[PDB]
Amino acid sequence: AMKITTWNVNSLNVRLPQVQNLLADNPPDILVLQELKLDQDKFPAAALQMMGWHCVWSGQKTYNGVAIVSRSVPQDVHFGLPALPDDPQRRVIAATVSGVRVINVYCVNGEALDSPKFKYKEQWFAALTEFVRDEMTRHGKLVLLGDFNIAPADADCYDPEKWHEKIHCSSVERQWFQNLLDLGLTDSLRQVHPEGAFYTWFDYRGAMFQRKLGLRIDHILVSPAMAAALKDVRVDLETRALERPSDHAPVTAEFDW
DNA sequence: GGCTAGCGAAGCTAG
């Protein structure tokens, strides 16, 4: 049995009490975080270590930031993407926890399709694809998870016509997501729930969460051996409903052996 | 768009 959770916290300094409540009440074996928004030396390691968790993280000031939190020691920690060595943005950290290779990604948002950040998103997803491909030659049990900032299909967007060829929903972004699936990875939540709306992000503006209008952009992609052990995937909307929430909801995948 | 958070002390960027 194994329980893994991904959560974009949108600044861990703000969301730390909710992260700790998440770890005490129904704990996962592994919790990965995105957008820590704090430098390498500002991570709250002591607060999480005192509760019995091992922490590895990659941080920078103000932006980005990724972390892996587990009860067992995370081994062979890799930082970044080898095909993109000069990129200072801290978006990728990978470690092996209990025989499972965990790759935590805070994928590039892109801002808009005509934004220079969209070409950066293009290069970045190309660099990510080569990294996961090389990693998958070594680890039969592998999980690529995090904030992909890509809604895979129209069932993952509350208004597909309004979002036609818009950021997160464009057909080229959906090809990049498909390029990751073509490595042998499974959209774990669509294997459990082939149909229905399972949005993970709700815009802060216009009370979009109360209207239940959002996107599914936080995913858990698993290798064939992990897919055969998959039993459930859920989106935790209770946490999204808390006072002063993150705009993302946590996603938890459960495996058995 | 019409929040939120960071930086820093005011509006900007970024999400």
Residue numbers in the entry: 0 to 256
Sentences from the paper on this structure:
NExo is an enzyme from Neisseria meningitidis that is specialized in the removal of the 3′-phosphate and other 3′-lesions, which are potential blocks for DNA repair. NExo is a highly active DNA 3′-phosphatase, and although it is from the class II AP family it lacks AP endonuclease activity. NExo folds into two planes of beta sheets sandwiched between two planes of alpha helices. Notably, the amino acids residues of the active site of the NExo 3′-phosphatase are identical to the active sites of NApe, E. coli Exo III and human APEX1.
